Write an enzyme that holds these catalytic residues in place. Structure first.
Site, PDB file in Angstrom:
ATOM      1  N   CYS B 108       6.429   9.975  -3.128  1.00  0.00           N
ATOM      2  CA  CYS B 108       5.162   9.368  -3.562  1.00  0.00           C
ATOM      3  C   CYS B 108       4.683   9.925  -4.900  1.00  0.00           C
ATOM      4  CB  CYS B 108       4.076   9.581  -2.507  1.00  0.00           C
ATOM      5  SG  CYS B 108       2.496   8.884  -3.054  1.00  0.00           S
ATOM      6  N   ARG B 111       0.494  11.306  -5.492  1.00  0.00           N
ATOM      7  CA  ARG B 111      -0.034  12.407  -4.693  1.00  0.00           C
ATOM      8  C   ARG B 111      -1.117  13.260  -5.353  1.00  0.00           C
ATOM      9  NH1 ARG B 111       5.170  15.517  -2.834  1.00  0.00           N
ATOM     10  NH2 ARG B 111       6.071  14.368  -4.598  1.00  0.00           N
ATOM     11  N   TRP B 280      -3.855   2.372  -3.835  1.00  0.00           N
ATOM     12  CA  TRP B 280      -3.884   1.284  -4.786  1.00  0.00           C
ATOM     13  C   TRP B 280      -2.514   1.185  -5.454  1.00  0.00           C
ATOM     14  CZ3 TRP B 280      -7.421   5.360  -5.138  1.00  0.00           C
ATOM     15  CH2 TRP B 280      -7.108   6.370  -6.056  1.00  0.00           C
ATOM     16  N   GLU B 285       5.200  -1.836  -9.025  1.00  0.00           N
ATOM     17  CA  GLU B 285       5.569  -2.238  -7.680  1.00  0.00           C
ATOM     18  C   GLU B 285       5.548  -3.757  -7.574  1.00  0.00           C
ATOM     19  OE1 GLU B 285       3.957   0.456  -4.472  1.00  0.00           O
ATOM     20  OE2 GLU B 285       2.672   1.120  -6.114  1.00  0.00           O
TER      21      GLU B 285
HETATM   22  C1  HEM Z   1      -3.504   6.152  -4.179  1.00  0.00           C
HETATM   23  C2  HEM Z   1      -2.530   5.647  -4.940  1.00  0.00           C
HETATM   24  C3  HEM Z   1      -1.040   5.641  -4.527  1.00  0.00           C
HETATM   25  C4  HEM Z   1      -0.064   5.275  -5.359  1.00  0.00           C
HETATM   26  C5  HEM Z   1      -0.231   4.828  -6.835  1.00  0.00           C
HETATM   27  C6  HEM Z   1       1.198   5.389  -4.663  1.00  0.00           C
HETATM   28  C7  HEM Z   1       2.416   5.081  -5.218  1.00  0.00           C
HETATM   29  C8  HEM Z   1       3.601   5.109  -4.540  1.00  0.00           C
HETATM   30  C9  HEM Z   1       4.848   4.526  -4.983  1.00  0.00           C
HETATM   31  C10 HEM Z   1       5.064   3.733  -6.294  1.00  0.00           C
HETATM   32  C11 HEM Z   1       5.770   4.800  -4.066  1.00  0.00           C
HETATM   33  C12 HEM Z   1       7.250   4.356  -4.109  1.00  0.00           C
HETATM   34  C13 HEM Z   1       7.438   3.388  -2.948  1.00  0.00           C
HETATM   35  C14 HEM Z   1       8.094   2.096  -3.345  1.00  0.00           C
HETATM   36  O1  HEM Z   1       8.599   1.989  -4.488  1.00  0.00           O
HETATM   37  O2  HEM Z   1       8.113   1.168  -2.497  1.00  0.00           O
HETATM   38  C15 HEM Z   1       5.138   5.562  -2.996  1.00  0.00           C
HETATM   39  C16 HEM Z   1       5.761   6.050  -1.867  1.00  0.00           C
HETATM   40  C17 HEM Z   1       5.144   6.678  -0.803  1.00  0.00           C
HETATM   41  N1  HEM Z   1       3.774   6.883  -0.651  1.00  0.00           N
HETATM   42 FE1  HEM Z   1       2.343   6.705  -2.189  1.00  0.00          FE
HETATM   43  N2  HEM Z   1       0.950   5.823  -3.369  1.00  0.00           N
HETATM   44  C18 HEM Z   1      -0.425   5.988  -3.251  1.00  0.00           C
HETATM   45  C19 HEM Z   1      -1.063   6.399  -2.103  1.00  0.00           C
HETATM   46  C20 HEM Z   1      -0.479   6.866  -0.948  1.00  0.00           C
HETATM   47  C21 HEM Z   1      -1.177   7.217   0.283  1.00  0.00           C
HETATM   48  C22 HEM Z   1      -2.714   7.103   0.471  1.00  0.00           C
HETATM   49  C23 HEM Z   1      -0.243   7.627   1.164  1.00  0.00           C
HETATM   50  C24 HEM Z   1      -0.349   8.156   2.605  1.00  0.00           C
HETATM   51  C25 HEM Z   1      -1.512   8.558   3.143  1.00  0.00           C
HETATM   52  C26 HEM Z   1       1.049   7.551   0.501  1.00  0.00           C
HETATM   53  C27 HEM Z   1       2.256   7.893   1.054  1.00  0.00           C
HETATM   54  C28 HEM Z   1       3.495   7.543   0.546  1.00  0.00           C
HETATM   55  C29 HEM Z   1       4.738   7.813   1.227  1.00  0.00           C
HETATM   56  C30 HEM Z   1       4.916   8.525   2.587  1.00  0.00           C
HETATM   57  C31 HEM Z   1       5.831   7.236   0.344  1.00  0.00           C
HETATM   58  C32 HEM Z   1       7.349   7.314   0.635  1.00  0.00           C
HETATM   59  C33 HEM Z   1       7.911   6.134   1.409  1.00  0.00           C
HETATM   60  C34 HEM Z   1       9.346   6.468   1.738  1.00  0.00           C
HETATM   61  O3  HEM Z   1       9.644   7.652   2.071  1.00  0.00           O
HETATM   62  O4  HEM Z   1      10.193   5.546   1.670  1.00  0.00           O
HETATM   63  N3  HEM Z   1       0.867   7.074  -0.773  1.00  0.00           N
HETATM   64  N4  HEM Z   1       3.805   5.730  -3.321  1.00  0.00           N
HETATM   65  C1  LIG Z   2      -0.220   3.650   0.122  1.00  0.00           C
HETATM   66  C2  LIG Z   2       0.656   2.934  -0.883  1.00  0.00           C
HETATM   67  C3  LIG Z   2       0.324   2.906  -2.230  1.00  0.00           C
HETATM   68  C4  LIG Z   2       1.161   2.231  -3.125  1.00  0.00           C
HETATM   69  N1  LIG Z   2       0.850   2.195  -4.444  1.00  0.00           N
HETATM   70  N2  LIG Z   2       2.280   1.614  -2.675  1.00  0.00           N
HETATM   71  C5  LIG Z   2       2.618   1.630  -1.366  1.00  0.00           C
HETATM   72  C6  LIG Z   2       3.870   0.935  -0.885  1.00  0.00           C
HETATM   73  C7  LIG Z   2       5.040   1.881  -1.114  1.00  0.00           C
HETATM   74  C8  LIG Z   2       5.754   2.173   0.187  1.00  0.00           C
HETATM   75  C9  LIG Z   2       5.374   3.271   0.948  1.00  0.00           C
HETATM   76  C10 LIG Z   2       6.019   3.538   2.153  1.00  0.00           C
HETATM   77  F1  LIG Z   2       5.643   4.601   2.885  1.00  0.00           F
HETATM   78  C11 LIG Z   2       7.056   2.720   2.592  1.00  0.00           C
HETATM   79  C12 LIG Z   2       7.444   1.626   1.826  1.00  0.00           C
HETATM   80  C13 LIG Z   2       8.569   0.732   2.298  1.00  0.00           C
HETATM   81  C14 LIG Z   2       9.736   0.830   1.316  1.00  0.00           C
HETATM   82  C15 LIG Z   2      10.406  -0.524   1.087  1.00  0.00           C
HETATM   83  C16 LIG Z   2      10.661  -1.260   2.396  1.00  0.00           C
HETATM   84  C17 LIG Z   2      11.961  -2.023   2.180  1.00  0.00           C
HETATM   85  C18 LIG Z   2      12.457  -1.619   0.796  1.00  0.00           C
HETATM   86  N3  LIG Z   2      11.731  -0.388   0.462  1.00  0.00           N
HETATM   87  C19 LIG Z   2      12.443   0.745   1.063  1.00  0.00           C
HETATM   88  C20 LIG Z   2       6.790   1.352   0.626  1.00  0.00           C
HETATM   89  C21 LIG Z   2       1.808   2.292  -0.454  1.00  0.00           C
END
Ligand code: HEM
Ligand SMILES: Cc1cc(N)nc(CCc2cc(F)cc(CC[C@@H]3CCCN3C)c2)c1
Ligand code: HEM
Ligand SMILES: Cc1cc(N)nc(CCc2cc(F)cc(CC[C@@H]3CCCN3C)c2)c1
Ligand SMILES: C[C@H](O)[C@H](O)[C@H]1CNc2nc(N)[nH]c(=O)c2N1
Ligand SMILES: C[C@H](O)[C@H](O)[C@H]1CNc2nc(N)[nH]c(=O)c2N1
Ligand SMILES: [Zn+2]
Lengths: 407, 411
Positions: B108, B111, B280, B285
């Site tokens: 993420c 963070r 947000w 994305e």
């Molecule tokens: C507040 C603004 C936030 C932004 C800009 C953000 C951005 C992102 C982005 C760009 C990814 C890559 C995922 C993808 O490409 O699909 C990601 C992953 C992730 N985010 Fe954040 N996020 C935010 C908030 C949060 C919150 C509030 C949580 C949990 C309480 C969180 C937990 C996670 C987790 C666990 C992943 C990893 C998913 C995985 O392991 O495949 N994020 N985030």
């Molecule tokens: C809170 C939040 C903020 C943000 N800005 N964006 C997201 C979406 C990113 C994301 C977080 C996850 F915890 C799991 C997934 C699924 C990953 C996808 C599913 C299939 C392909 N890819 C692996 C996306 C979530």
């Protein structure tokens, strides 16, 4: 233990069995992944030789043959006797080609089997090294129709008689720090440029000065040589739409030629083994021109484009980046110098991976290096799972010689 | 032991000691790196050490390690486990746990915001209707008329694995995908399987290119039920371009609230299988992945056609040109409608500052380079040049298998 890799854009799944033949270590453990880290006696030698000879005779379908056993025996004898051994020309060529084949960070490996190998093991002096390197550059450049090549100088003996090319690439631009405070030319090469000057070189102190070669034979002090300008093919950079682009005064050289790595084959170490191919456009347009620690021209180009540089969210850096990389490709293509764009190169690598998985059982690949530095996810390699592991023969990093050289 | 990471643009070197607190595995070995692999039931036995370690961390953070409150809580949790085979977190511990699961999320990039998370306790929920209400409230709170606020809603923890709470949606808000008989896809191709399930469960699909999916909610191990999110709660942004007037006529829009609803939250050995969270969007994305993945909406062709780019050879970089313009439009549209969004330059710069801060105060910051680096313009962002160490801390968010593959149907 028999691993699968998936492509998430195509759902194609490949099964890897080649990794089980891995030898060296990755730097990772079960507790920590170091995938993004840039740089993580007589007895040891014969098993290394045996492993290599085994794979070589397998490749020519003579595993377990008389000739195989005889050669194993002959090398065994030569090691017990001389504490080292020499490769047959055929083994040298195979070893070099497979070092490239095994280079997990290289997206260009579909070409691996078409490498021209120049045997320079009879070389004894820096003047001889210079001769071999001029011939390499001329052969590889081929009037813009570039051809892959490697030149292999004598192998390490006692570590005191090393052959080294001190330059990181055969062809690179000098860098000087200004009294003003900034940097003229290539900031990457500021230290090396100093060592050239602080050893004899007379610098034109320009922005694109082709550095001299610093060549070290048999452990001696290194010597300066200027590559004949007529052998250094350069490309003026212009844009197919923006006519002010030419006024930026940019140019780059056609030949990417890495000269500071170490080639390991069957336990033998070749400390001087310059190799060359042809560029992927982003190496110049994204990294060389737009890295903040390099020529860093983004702001200048954006300004000429009249972009809104007030806020980062106008994506003015991104727009300029694309146009710069359009210019690079357009310029090489116009001057008929071989270059490949990141779309073609990564599509080629996917094809190569499939070939390797099918005919070899796998393809070690480093995602962090294989995915291009721009437009990552619209290239097929972004969606491609990759397994990274270390096979031999291999190219390895080695310390910069000035830190090691008993002067 | 010490471990150092180097930023190759700034030469800044940080020292990691936090990796020593790592428990879970990575998937890598000395002989192979699995860093680019996408995705690399619990008894009383292993539970109390998991509980103890979490409670130690909790009481350390509040400067009460070894206090009577600490020792009593350990005692209490111990007796609760040996007599009930599980235990309940205090509200304070739950909040701490959820925030640290986010903090520990190595993939993420957002963070820097981890400490400002609104935690909604839904552990008293018992039915899918109750779930729907909690989820509506979350969406309304998080959306805040465009001024987005991070939040998580936490439903009851797993017991015997046969009474799981699950949100069957991958995200709370998502567009339907429909496979056509001619092989083409209407809407979001990523959501075709889930859409077919909703339809099977009785959803009357509008069959348009941007239909918001119904919620499919499972409480206490029961068969899941369909619910429609009130449309007035679903904020959407029409996509237009600041220079190109024809862009609006592409008919694109997207929802404002990214809300992940299929992950598992582990805290002190407890498993929360339904824990939707939201923040947000980072612009890429939507603009890069959602719109331009070949397997998603895939609008590069259309956009490049209307831009009249040289589309015959790839080396014109027509794909790269269209991609940038689309991402400009997404950012422009969100900002114009005053919906919170961040561009990838701002987000990555903030992440570097976060990461450096975490090294200084925490001794490290686990980070997955493969995911942290944005899917466009990688090397002109500061994270590209940043060495990172990936390891697993708990509390954590984990993947779990899709419920329709494991669910025992009642009827
Ligand atoms: C507040 C603004 C936030 C932004 C800009 C953000 C951005 C992102 C982005 C760009 C990814 C890559 C995922 C993808 O490409 O699909 C990601 C992953 C992730 N985010 Fe954040 N996020 C935010 C908030 C949060 C919150 C509030 C949580 C949990 C309480 C969180 C937990 C996670 C987790 C666990 C992943 C990893 C998913 C995985 O392991 O495949 N994020 N985030
Ligand atoms: C809170 C939040 C903020 C943000 N800005 N964006 C997201 C979406 C990113 C994301 C977080 C996850 F915890 C799991 C997934 C699924 C990953 C996808 C599913 C299939 C392909 N890819 C692996 C996306 C979530
Ligand atoms: C012919 C066309 C070739 C292309 C398009 C190509 C492309 C690339 C690119 C883009 C990289 C990334 C490195 C960086 O970003 O600095 C790379 C790395 C590498 N290439 Fe290739 N290359 C080619 C030929 C060769 C040849 C002929 C060899 C050796 C015989 C070779 C060996 C390597 C090695 C060893 C690395 C990784 C070095 C490291 O570990 O840092 N390449 N290549
Ligand atoms: C033959 C060839 C073809 C090509 N198309 N391109 C290159 C240059 C890419 C490269 C290859 C290497 F074998 C080693 C290095 C050194 C790594 C550099 C040094 C500083 C930054 N980076 C770590 C670069 C070489
Ligand atoms: C194969 C590879 O791991 C996969 O395509 C990853 C790469 N990095 C990513 N990074 C982010 N942020 N999101 C993703 O979905 C992916 N996909
Ligand atoms: C820290 C990180 O490993 C470093 O910036 C790497 C990332 N990937 C790269 N990939 C390529 N092809 N070339 C590079 O120099 C780098 N640099
Ligand atoms: Zn690893």
């Amino acid at each position: 233990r028999f691993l699968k890799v998936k492509n998430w854009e195509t759902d194609v799944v490949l099964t890897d069995t080649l990794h089980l033949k891995s030898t060296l270590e990755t730097g990772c453990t079960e507790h920590i992944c170091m995938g993004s880290i840039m740089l993580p006696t007589k007895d040891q030698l014969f098993p290394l030789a045996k492993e290599f000879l085994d794979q070589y005779y397998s490749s020519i379908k003579r595993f377990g043959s008389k000739a195989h056993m005889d050669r194993l025996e002959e090398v065994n004898k030569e090691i017990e006797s001389t504490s080292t051994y020499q490769l047959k020309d055929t083994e040298l060529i195979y070893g070099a080609k497979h070092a490239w084949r095994n280079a997990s960070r290289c997206v260009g490996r579909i070409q691996w089997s078409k490498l021209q190998v120049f045997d320079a093991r009879d070389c004894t002096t820096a003047h001889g090294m210079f001769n071999y390197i001029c011939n390499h550059v001329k052969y590889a450049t081929n009037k813009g129709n570039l051809r892959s090549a490697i030149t292999i100088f004598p192998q390490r003996t006692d570590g005191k008689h090393d052959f080294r090319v001190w330059n990181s690439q055969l062809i690179r631009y000098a860098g000087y720090k200004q009294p003003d405070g900034s940097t003229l030319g290539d900031p990457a090469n500021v230290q090396f440029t100093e060592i050239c000057i602080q050893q004899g070189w007379k610098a034109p102190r320009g922005r694109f000065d082709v550095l001299p070669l610093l060549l070290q034979a048999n452990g001696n002090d290194p010597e300066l040589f200027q590559i004949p300008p007529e052998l250094v093919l350069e490309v003026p950079i212009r844009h197919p739409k923006f006519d002010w682009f030419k006024d930026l005064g940019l140019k780059w050289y056609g030949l990417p030629a890495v000269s500071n790595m170490l080639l390991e084959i069957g336990g033998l170490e070749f400390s001087a083994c310059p190799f060359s191919g042809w560029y992927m456009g982003t190496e110049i347009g994204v990294r060389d021109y737009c890295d903040n620690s390099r020529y860093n021209i983004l702001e200048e180009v954006a300004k000429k484009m009249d972009l809104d540089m007030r806020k980062t969210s106008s994506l003015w850096k991104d727009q300029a980046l694309v146009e710069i990389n359009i210019a690079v490709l357009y310029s090489f293509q116009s001057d008929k110098v071989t270059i490949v764009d990141h779309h073609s190169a990564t599509e080629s690598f996917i094809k190569h991976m499939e070939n390797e998985y099918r005919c070899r059982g796998g393809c070690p690949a480093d995602w962090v290096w294989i995915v291009p530095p721009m437009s990552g996810s619209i290239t097929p390699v972004f969606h491609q799972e990759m397994l990274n592991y270390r096979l031999t023969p291999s190219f390895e990093y080695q310390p910069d010689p000035w830190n090691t050289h008993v002067w």
